[PDB]
């Protein structure tokens, strides 16, 4: 009957180890990096630096980023992440099944998933310079592939009106899906990034802080 004492000692040691690990588990924040192919996800993760894990710390806050296709069923495991980062090629509107239409369909499918009811999405609209060159060079029109561009007018804060309309139309097309069935549980944060940019990590930090603050405000019935 002496084995009971040894078992209790082992249980105590394991409980102490788990108690130590709980704090470091609760301190970190998890982000899921989801993007369509040829969008530029590799460049973004390289700038930030069957699975890939990236470690980075901003202002003494530990973040943890993950990267990973048809009938996505593994997505149920990602209902407790802080936010979902979406990378989409804004200039690939005619590199045809338009590459963009597939991106909007994927975004709509992810938004309405049952297990992702309370997960926000951070949206990166990559490849702005290619889009600007394509719209300015001529022989390519947004109206040709997307008929709705004819009846669209500029809402706005410019950083060349044609490229401004081109930039804002794609953003509004995603924002409409975002606000169709938001219900106040989760929002979207559009952004206009490029390959040669700095402080993209600051955007992620600020958006995570905003998400956490909004959730806390909603919990106490103040928003």
């Amino acid at each position: 009957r002496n084995e009971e004492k040894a078992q209790r000692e082992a249980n105590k040691k394991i409980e102490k180890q788990l108690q130590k690990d709980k704090q470091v588990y609760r301190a970190t924040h998890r982000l899921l990096l989801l993007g369509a192919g040829e969008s530029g996800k590799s460049t973004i993760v390289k700038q930030m630096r069957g699975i890939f894990e990236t470690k980075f710390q901003v202002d003494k806050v530990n973040f943890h980023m993950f990267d990973v296709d048809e009938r996505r069923k593994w997505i149920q495991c990602f209902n407790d992440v802080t936010a979902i980062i979406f990378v989409v090629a804004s200039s690939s509107y005619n590199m045809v099944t338009n590459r963009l239409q597939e991106a909007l369909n994927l975004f709509k499918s992810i938004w309405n998933n049952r297990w992702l009811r309370t997960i926000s999405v951070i949206l990166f609209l990559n490849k702005q310079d290619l889009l600007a060159e394509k719209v300015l060079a001529g022989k390519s029109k947004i109206e040709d592939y997307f008929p709705e561009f004819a009846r669209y007018t500029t809402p706005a804060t410019p950083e060349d009106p044609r490229v401004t309309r081109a930039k804002y139309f794609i953003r509004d097309e995603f924002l409409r899906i975002s606000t169709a069935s938001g219900d106040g549980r989760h929002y979207c944060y559009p952004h206009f990034t490029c390959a040669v940019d700095t402080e993209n990590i600051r955007r992620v930090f600020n958006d995570c802080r905003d998400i956490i603050q909004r959730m806390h405000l909603r919990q106490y019935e103040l928003l």
Binding site: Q7, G50, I51, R71, K73, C77
Partner: protein
């Protein structure tokens, strides 16, 4: 086209199956009396997991058990005294299955990483790392102490060899993802339930498909095997459990109700095979009757969805795992 040319076969096999069914099992089973209301109360509760629990497997001694969580830890429990024995950290934080060796010396666990890992309990360090799958692992079972059969998310099942670390036999034929499998007591034939609403019977020795069943109409999430060895039950997302048969090669009964529209996550039998236990997404578990189709009880007490289920070899208790990071022992 040419393919359409024998699409008829399927119709001929369906007609033969219809001609085979003389009468439903229900009619045959009508005279026997009902089991009645069965009340089960929880006996033990285990705490220590920091995240949701995905899978668990009872030990062969009906005393110990192992569980896996999203925090990246495997813990071996002791049911009688509810004290932890082991805690193994994991390289990958995403796990979807776990298994316990029949000889009680090895534990295996795989997940979203396309790797199956085996640990040595009595030496706790990594002993082998099996690779070769192009999709996430969904289930794995120890066929013996030297060879293991696994099912992956790339529509294939394989039989491995631990000593050499290379595949021995590869099973192909499904279209959708493979989600769960079970082994016969004789360890000669095993079944699998794919995501294409189809179940197949495989032969380990031959390596070729033998029979196919396509009763369901949605994704199949769990599958169990009747103790006698001549039947198996499965559960899908359409809130229906169906009991098939190997010899008759057709469905015999359906377990469904109009007051439930949620999915099914786990299915298990009892020692006698009279009781069928299935876990739902309705935050609780239901106990059916294998023959009559009546409901005989409910297992409530979990605050989040149930994702695991198991029955001991001697049938002294039944364990449930949920996303609430709690393990409960019922009796």
């Amino acid at each position: 086209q040419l393919r359409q040319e024998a699409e008829q076969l399927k119709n001929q096999i369906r007609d033969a199956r219809k001609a085979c069914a003389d009468a439903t099992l229900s009619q045959i089973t009508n005279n026997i009396d009902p089991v009645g209301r069965i009340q089960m109360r929880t006996r033990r509760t285990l705490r220590g997991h920091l995240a949701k629990i995905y899978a668990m497997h009872w030990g062969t001694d009906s005393r110990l058990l192992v569980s896996a969580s999203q925090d990246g830890k495997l813990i071996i429990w002791d049911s009688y005294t509810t004290n932890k024995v082991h805690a193994i950290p994991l390289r990958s934080s995403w796990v979807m299955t776990c298994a316990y060796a029949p000889s009680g010396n090895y534990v295996a666990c795989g997940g979203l990483d396309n790797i199956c890992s085996i640990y040595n309990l009595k030496t706790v360090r990594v002993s082998r790392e099996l690779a070769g799958h192009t999709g996430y692992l969904s289930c794995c079972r120890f066929l013996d102490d030297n060879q293991i059969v696994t099912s992956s998310g790339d529509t294939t099942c394989a039989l491995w060899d631990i000593e050499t670390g290379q595949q021995t036999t590869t099973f192909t034929g499904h279209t959708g993802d493979v989600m769960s499998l079970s082994l016969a007591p004789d360890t000669r034939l095993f079944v699998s339930g794919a995501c294409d609403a189809s179940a197949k019977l495989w032969d380990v020795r031959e390596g070729m498909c033998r029979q196919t069943f396509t009763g369901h109409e949605s994704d199949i999430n769990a599958i169990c095997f009747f103790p006698n060895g001549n039947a198996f039950a499965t559960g899908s997302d359409d809130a229906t459990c169906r009991l098939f048969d190997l010899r008759a090669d057709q469905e015999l009964m359906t377990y469904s109700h109009d007051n439930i529209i949620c999915g099914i996550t786990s299915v298990s039998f009892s020692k006698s095979g009279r009781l069928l236990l299935a876990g739902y997404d309705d935050f609780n578990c239901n106990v059916w009757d294998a023959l009559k189709a009546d409901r005989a009880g409910v297992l409530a007490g979990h605050d989040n969805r149930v994702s695991c289920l198991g029955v001991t070899d001697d049938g002294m208790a039944v364990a449930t795992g949920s996303w609430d990071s709690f393990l409960k022992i019922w009796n």
